[PDB]
DNA sequence: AAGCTTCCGACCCTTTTTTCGGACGATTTAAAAAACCCTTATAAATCAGCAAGTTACGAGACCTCGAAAAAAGAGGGTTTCTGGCGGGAAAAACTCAAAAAACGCTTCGAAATCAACCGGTTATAGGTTTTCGGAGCTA
């Protein structure tokens, strides 16, 4: 399972999103990450982002 | 000798850093302009309290615009409370059947009886007091 993530967030939300994703993948651009990851991990990732969405 | 691969020089273009120049501001110094002083007897201002007439400054009010704060509206999400539907087990009606059990025939003669009133029997409605079961609690 191989993932590519992009963020269109802005203002206060962008900082929070960076706070989460940076702990799961190396950053490849200003707003994008790319990494391999297991299915369970990805589920945890989405759950975490949802928990504090704006 | 030829082809492939790799450096190297020449150049082209744009961005990033440095240097220089120019301009503007600030400060200092010098020059120019406004001003101060010294001579005045005579003319005008000083001021006394109050009247009579007027207003420059203060207060009130409203408007105007702009911005700030608050409230509302929107959207993202999670947790839970309820309702509907589906599924398995138990109950009870429904269907099928037998075997008793009652009823009738049908009893002339043997109990059953009601009545009022006494004493006596005792099931139990109702209330009173109490073990058993469960509360979970805690590692």
Short mmCIF file of C-alpha atoms (C1' of nucleotides) in Angstrom, two decimals:
data_model
loop_
_atom_site.label_atom_id
_atom_site.label_comp_id
_atom_site.label_asym_id
_atom_site.label_seq_id
_atom_site.Cartn_x
_atom_site.Cartn_y
_atom_site.Cartn_z
CA UNK A 1 0.00 0.00 0.00
CA UNK A 2 1.62 3.18 -1.30
CA UNK A 3 0.20 6.62 -0.63
CA UNK A 4 0.44 10.21 -1.84
CA UNK A 5 -1.14 12.95 0.29
CA UNK A 6 -1.91 16.56 -0.60
CA UNK A 7 -3.15 19.40 1.61
CA UNK A 8 -5.21 22.36 0.43
CA UNK A 9 -5.75 23.60 3.98
CA UNK A 10 -5.19 27.20 5.00
CA UNK A 11 -4.75 29.40 8.06
CA UNK A 12 -4.89 27.70 11.46
CA UNK A 13 -5.95 24.36 9.98
CA UNK A 14 -2.80 24.02 7.88
CA UNK A 15 -0.61 24.03 10.98
CA UNK A 16 -2.67 21.27 12.58
CA UNK A 17 -2.61 19.13 9.46
CA UNK A 18 1.15 19.49 9.27
CA UNK A 19 1.31 18.50 12.93
CA UNK A 20 -0.37 15.18 12.18
CA UNK A 21 0.96 14.12 8.78
CA UNK A 22 4.56 15.00 9.60
CA UNK A 23 4.47 12.16 12.14
CA UNK A 24 3.55 9.58 9.48
CA UNK A 25 5.57 10.45 6.36
CA UNK A 26 8.46 12.50 5.07
CA UNK A 27 7.46 15.81 3.51
CA UNK A 28 8.05 16.09 -0.23
CA UNK A 29 6.64 19.55 -0.92
CA UNK A 30 5.17 22.57 0.83
CA UNK A 31 1.92 20.64 1.25
CA UNK A 32 2.48 17.02 0.16
CA UNK A 33 3.72 13.75 1.62
CA UNK A 34 4.54 10.38 0.09
CA UNK A 35 5.31 7.07 1.79
CA UNK A 36 4.47 3.40 1.99
CA UNK A 37 2.06 2.57 4.80
CA UNK A 38 -0.08 -0.33 5.99
CA UNK A 39 -3.86 -0.31 5.76
CA UNK A 40 -4.29 -0.15 9.53
CA UNK A 41 -1.93 2.81 9.66
CA UNK A 42 -3.88 4.65 6.98
CA UNK A 43 -7.11 4.06 8.88
CA UNK A 44 -5.48 5.51 11.98
CA UNK A 45 -4.29 8.46 9.91
CA UNK A 46 -7.74 9.30 8.60
CA UNK A 47 -9.28 8.86 12.04
CA UNK A 48 -6.77 11.30 13.52
CA UNK A 49 -7.36 13.91 10.82
CA UNK A 50 -11.12 13.63 11.27
CA UNK A 51 -10.87 13.95 15.05
CA UNK A 52 -9.76 17.59 14.79
CA UNK A 53 -10.97 18.64 11.36
CA UNK A 54 -11.95 22.22 10.59
"C1'" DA B 1 40.12 4.80 -38.58
"C1'" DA B 2 35.41 5.25 -36.67
"C1'" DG B 3 32.03 5.50 -33.06
"C1'" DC B 4 30.86 6.36 -28.28
"C1'" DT B 5 31.59 8.77 -24.01
"C1'" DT B 6 33.43 12.23 -21.22
"C1'" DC B 7 35.50 16.66 -20.22
"C1'" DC B 8 36.31 21.44 -21.50
"C1'" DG B 9 35.62 26.25 -23.43
"C1'" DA B 10 32.40 29.57 -25.24
"C1'" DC B 11 28.12 31.57 -24.84
"C1'" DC B 12 23.33 32.96 -23.26
"C1'" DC B 13 20.05 34.35 -19.73
"C1'" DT B 14 18.31 35.54 -15.32
"C1'" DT B 15 18.68 36.18 -10.32
"C1'" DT B 16 21.41 37.58 -6.00
"C1'" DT B 17 24.92 40.27 -3.73
"C1'" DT B 18 27.99 44.24 -3.55
"C1'" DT B 19 29.44 48.84 -4.64
"C1'" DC B 20 28.82 53.19 -5.92
"C1'" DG B 21 26.30 57.27 -6.59
"C1'" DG B 22 22.66 60.26 -5.71
"C1'" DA B 23 19.23 62.15 -2.86
"C1'" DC B 24 17.32 63.44 1.38
"C1'" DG B 25 17.64 64.41 6.09
"C1'" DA B 26 20.11 66.36 9.88
"C1'" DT B 27 23.61 69.33 11.88
"C1'" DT B 28 26.83 73.03 11.89
"C1'" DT B 29 28.46 77.37 10.55
"C1'" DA B 30 28.13 81.82 8.48
"C1'" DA B 31 25.47 85.72 6.74
"C1'" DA B 32 21.27 88.47 6.65
"C1'" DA B 33 17.18 90.23 8.79
"C1'" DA B 34 14.60 91.59 12.63
"C1'" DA B 35 15.31 93.58 16.75
"C1'" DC B 36 17.27 96.41 21.15
"C1'" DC B 37 19.34 100.70 23.21
"C1'" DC B 38 20.17 105.38 23.82
"C1'" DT B 39 19.06 109.85 24.23
"C1'" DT B 40 12.11 112.50 25.51
"C1'" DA B 41 8.12 116.59 27.82
"C1'" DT B 42 3.77 115.79 26.51
"C1'" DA B 43 -0.20 112.63 25.47
"C1'" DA B 44 -2.45 108.82 26.68
"C1'" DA B 45 -3.20 104.72 29.87
"C1'" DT B 46 -3.95 103.43 34.57
"C1'" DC B 47 -8.37 102.11 37.87
"C1'" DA B 48 -10.82 102.63 41.90
"C1'" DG B 49 -17.96 99.71 41.47
"C1'" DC B 50 -21.55 99.42 39.53
"C1'" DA B 51 -24.94 99.80 35.57
"C1'" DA B 52 -26.31 98.47 30.81
"C1'" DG B 53 -25.59 95.72 26.54
"C1'" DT B 54 -22.96 91.74 23.98
"C1'" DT B 55 -20.61 87.39 23.18
"C1'" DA B 56 -16.44 83.52 22.93
"C1'" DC B 57 -16.42 79.33 25.04
"C1'" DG B 58 -19.06 75.30 26.75
"C1'" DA B 59 -22.71 72.13 26.53
"C1'" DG B 60 -26.24 69.56 24.25
"C1'" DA B 61 -27.75 67.28 20.51
"C1'" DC B 62 -27.67 64.65 16.16
"C1'" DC B 63 -25.54 62.70 12.14
"C1'" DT B 64 -22.04 60.22 9.54
"C1'" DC B 65 -19.03 57.01 8.70
"C1'" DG B 66 -16.15 53.52 9.81
"C1'" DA B 67 -14.74 49.79 12.45
"C1'" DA B 68 -15.27 46.11 16.23
"C1'" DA B 69 -17.82 42.78 18.68
"C1'" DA B 70 -21.43 39.68 18.94
"C1'" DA B 71 -24.64 36.79 17.16
"C1'" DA B 72 -26.09 34.03 13.93
"C1'" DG B 73 -25.41 30.68 10.27
"C1'" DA B 74 -22.67 27.01 8.22
"C1'" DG B 75 -20.11 23.02 8.10
"C1'" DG B 76 -17.04 19.00 10.18
"C1'" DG B 77 -17.32 15.41 13.23
"C1'" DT B 78 -18.47 11.88 16.97
"C1'" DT B 79 -21.53 9.47 20.34
"C1'" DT B 80 -25.81 7.50 21.53
"C1'" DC B 81 -30.54 6.75 21.70
"C1'" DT B 82 -34.51 4.61 19.31
"C1'" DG B 83 -37.13 2.19 15.87
"C1'" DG B 84 -37.77 -1.20 12.49
"C1'" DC B 85 -36.95 -5.54 10.90
"C1'" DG B 86 -35.29 -10.26 11.15
"C1'" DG B 87 -34.54 -14.56 13.52
"C1'" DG B 88 -34.93 -18.61 17.17
"C1'" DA B 89 -37.41 -20.57 21.14
"C1'" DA B 90 -41.35 -21.28 24.01
"C1'" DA B 91 -46.30 -21.20 24.64
"C1'" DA B 92 -50.78 -22.13 23.58
"C1'" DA B 93 -54.02 -22.67 20.82
"C1'" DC B 94 -55.45 -26.10 17.12
"C1'" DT B 95 -56.09 -30.73 15.50
"C1'" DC B 96 -56.51 -35.53 16.43
"C1'" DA B 97 -58.05 -39.65 20.04
"C1'" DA B 98 -58.92 -42.62 24.03
"C1'" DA B 99 -60.49 -43.65 28.16
"C1'" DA B 100 -62.51 -43.09 31.35
"C1'" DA B 101 -66.38 -40.47 33.91
"C1'" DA B 102 -70.79 -38.76 34.00
"C1'" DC B 103 -75.66 -39.09 32.89
"C1'" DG B 104 -80.15 -41.53 32.38
"C1'" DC B 105 -82.98 -44.95 32.86
"C1'" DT B 106 -84.90 -44.72 37.91
"C1'" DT B 107 -85.40 -45.64 42.33
"C1'" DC B 108 -89.17 -46.60 47.96
"C1'" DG B 109 -86.92 -46.05 51.47
"C1'" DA B 110 -82.95 -43.44 53.81
"C1'" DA B 111 -80.72 -38.70 54.53
"C1'" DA B 112 -81.01 -33.49 54.03
"C1'" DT B 113 -83.11 -30.08 55.32
"C1'" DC B 114 -83.97 -25.29 57.26
"C1'" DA B 115 -85.84 -22.71 60.58
"C1'" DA B 116 -83.26 -19.63 65.98
"C1'" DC B 117 -80.20 -19.62 69.47
"C1'" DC B 118 -76.50 -21.03 72.53
"C1'" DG B 119 -71.55 -22.32 72.89
"C1'" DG B 120 -67.40 -23.64 70.38
"C1'" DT B 121 -63.90 -24.30 65.91
"C1'" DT B 122 -60.27 -22.42 63.08
"C1'" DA B 123 -58.92 -20.59 58.34
"C1'" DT B 124 -56.83 -16.73 57.48
"C1'" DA B 125 -56.95 -11.37 56.31
"C1'" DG B 126 -54.11 -8.59 57.98
"C1'" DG B 127 -50.26 -7.02 60.12
"C1'" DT B 128 -45.32 -7.59 62.24
"C1'" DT B 129 -40.73 -9.08 62.27
"C1'" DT B 130 -37.09 -11.17 60.11
"C1'" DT B 131 -32.95 -14.66 56.55
"C1'" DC B 132 -31.88 -14.73 51.91
"C1'" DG B 133 -30.39 -12.67 48.00
"C1'" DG B 134 -28.28 -9.41 45.72
"C1'" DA B 135 -25.83 -4.33 45.60
"C1'" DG B 136 -22.10 -4.72 43.58
"C1'" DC B 137 -16.74 -3.29 45.58
"C1'" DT B 138 -12.10 -4.01 45.40
"C1'" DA B 139 -7.14 -6.29 43.50
#
